[PDB]
Amino acid sequence: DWGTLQTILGGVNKHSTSIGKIWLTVLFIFRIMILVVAAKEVWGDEQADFVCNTLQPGCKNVCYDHYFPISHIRLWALQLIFVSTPALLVAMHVAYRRHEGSLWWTYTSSIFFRVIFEAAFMYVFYVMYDGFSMQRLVKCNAWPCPNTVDCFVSRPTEKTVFTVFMIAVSGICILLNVTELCYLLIRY
Amino acid sequence: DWGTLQTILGGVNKHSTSIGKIWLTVLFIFRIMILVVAAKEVWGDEQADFVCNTLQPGCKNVCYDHYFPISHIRLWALQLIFVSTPALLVAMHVAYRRHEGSLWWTYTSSIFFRVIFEAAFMYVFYVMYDGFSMQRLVKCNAWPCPNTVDCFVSRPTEKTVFTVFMIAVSGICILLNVTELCYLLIRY
Amino acid sequence: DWGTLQTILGGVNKHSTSIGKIWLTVLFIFRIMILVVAAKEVWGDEQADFVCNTLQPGCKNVCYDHYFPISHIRLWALQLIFVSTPALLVAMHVAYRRHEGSLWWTYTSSIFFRVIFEAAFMYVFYVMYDGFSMQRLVKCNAWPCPNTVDCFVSRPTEKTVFTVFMIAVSGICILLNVTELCYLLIRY
Amino acid sequence: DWGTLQTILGGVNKHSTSIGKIWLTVLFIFRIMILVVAAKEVWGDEQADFVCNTLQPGCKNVCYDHYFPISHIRLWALQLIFVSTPALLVAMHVAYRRHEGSLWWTYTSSIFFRVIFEAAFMYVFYVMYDGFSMQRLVKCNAWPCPNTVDCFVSRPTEKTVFTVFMIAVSGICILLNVTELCYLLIRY
Amino acid sequence: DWGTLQTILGGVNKHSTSIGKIWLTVLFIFRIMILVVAAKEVWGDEQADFVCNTLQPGCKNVCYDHYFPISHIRLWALQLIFVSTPALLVAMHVAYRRHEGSLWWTYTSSIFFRVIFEAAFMYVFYVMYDGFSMQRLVKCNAWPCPNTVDCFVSRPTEKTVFTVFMIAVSGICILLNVTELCYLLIRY
Amino acid sequence: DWGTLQTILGGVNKHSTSIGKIWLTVLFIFRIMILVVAAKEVWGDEQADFVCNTLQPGCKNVCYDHYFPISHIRLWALQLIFVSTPALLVAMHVAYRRHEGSLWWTYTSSIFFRVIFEAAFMYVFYVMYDGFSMQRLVKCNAWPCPNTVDCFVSRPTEKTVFTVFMIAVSGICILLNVTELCYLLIRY
């Protein structure tokens, strides 16, 4: 929903650098549009259409929870909020400044927190789901499922396409932030 | 939804102290974003996907009600409203003041109510759910369920992750308020 | 939804008295937040999860209608609209005045209608549901149910918590209005 | 949704008469609030929870259509739009006037169309549903239902309460318009 | 949703003629209100409640598709967008003009496209659905349905009422545009 | 939702050329209206109403995923975002310019990226779905479906109508951009 975000993005459109003015902000808007407009309804029936070949009551609940401890959309929602906080803090700091070394140290710290935040979430996506490709079939042997029970995921291919798309864009944002640090580092 | 909250948070952005200007407000916004964007849809199917291994009609309703007297999202919604009231009252009080001891006593009372409100809700979350970890299996023996009936919870792991996240952030907000009282106390 | 309610509450924030400026308005906002944010989704599955132990077609419809002639959320929605009308009328009356006895009589009449409106709805909640506690089991013998049929309510405990919360806040608003009348009565 | 209706109602708040300024506008807002906030979700499951005691395929569709040619909420939605048109036309006519007999004839014609529009819809509600009370049981013998089939309505009591409430308020609006005509008629 | 449409309709409220200022714009708003507020939820369960008397898998999908190649609400949505384009183009053309023969030719062409657009869609509604009345029973013999299968439509009467209402209003808009051409033609 | 898009489209309404001012912007708005108002609810039950003639658990999930790797609405959502980025970048570039060769090279590059972006997505729609016509019947032999299983698509005809409509409009936008390049090329 639009609401009044134009004031926020327009307000933070200033107080930036050569690449922070445009390139780092359009990509952040780019990820929000993908998550809200298209990606949010792909995971709508993640559990409703999760089908297991068994008659054991409660086996469906435990198997979905075992292989999906947290949904992909929830992780992406958390990642965007975390990376948007250092930018927000420095955005209102220059307003107080207009109301240099400490400001320079404040700015160079925000770009350092964004790199590790994106790297951490990108690392979580790999260890938790053993890769960026979602499989059609998952084998589940958790209690109370008898022996091993075959379960099938809903829309595995479409979720894979968005998973690769989100990771690739986040990797690009890391490169821009790294070049931003190098740009300021040489200037001293 | 954005609507016009920017005027509220922007309006209450002033009339604050060294840490109340930024740190105590971003965390309050942080909890709202988590509850609305991500956490609210995790508890969407709390009762729909609640499965019990029985054929007794009405046993599902009583067991879910017994182990979930009030949903976690409802408690968090109540907590945010209560803690936001003392800040709102003092926010409009300084507007009347611009329209010192009594103002100082008014301000130091708001930070005292927020500490006990957050402590009370944090205490309720512990006694009601015997900890911050949600179990996959719950054993239910309430009428009319015959003997003991096994029931299974929906998304126990994902709800645990958000439960720990909300508690940890609320604990941080307590520390900031405590330091705020100590900051004013030494000044006298 | 925010929309433009800030203009309404901000507009009616003026034209008030010592307690009408803040205390009587925050509680009115307090009840709206509880009803919309949390309480509205508790009654979402009031009839969907209503379970009766019978095979008679149509017995479920008649029993739910017999014990729930009108939902609690609908009654609270009606109550808020009725109590907000006398305040709205006097809010736009002073605008015409700025555009004393008659104004004083107009103001003292609004606080009189709000007391009886809240008392009436509070009385309806008692006679209709024989108390503020909702039971897990209801015994139904209306046609076409054969003999007496046991039916089970959805989320009886959680609805009880909000029922007590709404009644208690409404009782507090009665006391404030009563003191408002006494405050003006002594002044003459 | 609020959106920008405050400009519309605030704009049409002027250009009125002694009772058109307040009394005739608050009641019109009153009906909108009832229809949107509370009444619209009562008829949500009108057909989903419509249950017939038969095994004949397609008998449910024909019986619901026979006894409910048009839903109550749809009729109320049509009625509000029709009655709001004469007021809207004269609202923008005085703006052209500021940009007397013809204006007086224009104004007195709007109150004449509103009386017959409300009377017509009130008459339709009576002949179509043979009264303002909804029954729990309806007997249906339309093809392809064999012989007579018993069907049960969803929430008959709650729909009756709102049906009486809407009719009573509409009857009050007729009286105000009638007095408005008499008020101008004596003045000549 | 309101949003900012008041600026659009208010902006295009000017730059019109004797009947284009009011009559042709209120009817266009009239159709939008009917389609959004009331008519859009009537077709909500068009396929969910479509019932066929057969046990053949996939027969329900083919029969609904055969008799409903495109929903009525989708056709009305397309019609409103098409007819609103010539008005929009001339609305921004006069803004460039303020920034006569060509303008006169531009204006008289917009009213010519609106007549044929409404006539075309009105013709499509007739040939596709063989009239403006929807039947309760449809006989389907498409593959893989064996022989002829009886299927039943959801809410046939209510959809008929709105179908006649939309056609009648669109016919009125044709007459206004025709008189607009005749009004300018005699003037030369 | 309107929100504040009028400022965006109104803001980018300037800074354009003879055809970029109106023709290229109304078509872009045209596609958004079709996708949001009408086309988005056609694909609502794409998987819910997907029916296969088999008793093998999990065969429905794999067959829908095999023939629909990504939904048509998701592809259109991606296409609109990509084509809207070059226009957005040059829209804010002229604001910096007002705050010629490089500007001319910047403008002529945006129209070059839009041609290849639309051509690429149009090519994807052809190879992935072997044409712009959707079939009622799909034959599926992927594991674990035994032998070949017949499955039926929901609303194949209505989706075909919108598929042709979206492709045709996108083809028109390519022609306008091509003429835009030729218009500037001759001028040099």
Residue numbers in the entry:
A (entry chain J), B (entry chain I), C (entry chain H), D (entry chain G), E (entry chain L), F (entry chain K): 2 to 100, 129 to 217
Quote the study's own text:
Connexins form large-pore channels that function either as dodecameric gap junctions or hexameric hemichannels to allow the regulated movement of small molecules and ions across cell membranes. Each subunit consists of 4 transmembrane helices (TM1–4), an N-terminal helix, which lines the funnel entrance, a cytoplasmic loop, two extracellular loops, and a short C-terminal tail. Here, we use cryoelectron microscopy (cryo-EM) to determine the structure of human Cx26 gap junctions under increasing levels of PCO2.
The analysis for the data corresponding to the PCO2 of 90 mmHg was the most interesting. Here, out of the eight given classes, the majority of particles divided into three classes, which, in order of particle number, result in maps with nominal resolutions of 2.0, 2.1, and 2.6 Å. The second class, however, had a much better defined N terminus extending to a solid ring in the center of the funnel. A comparison of the maps derived from particles in classes 1 and 2, respectively, indicates there is a rotation of the whole cytoplasmic region of the protein relative to the extracellular side, with a flexing of TM2, in particular. This movement appears to be coupled to how well the N termini are defined in the density and has the aspect of an iris-like movement. Comparing the two resulting structures (denoted hereafter as structure Class 1 [C1] and C2) shows that the cytoplasmic part of TM2 flexes at Pro 87 such that there is an almost rigid body rotation of 14° of the C terminal part of the helix from residues Ala88 to Glu101. Morphing between these structures indicates that as TM2 moves, the N terminus and the following residues, including the first few residues of TM1, also change position.
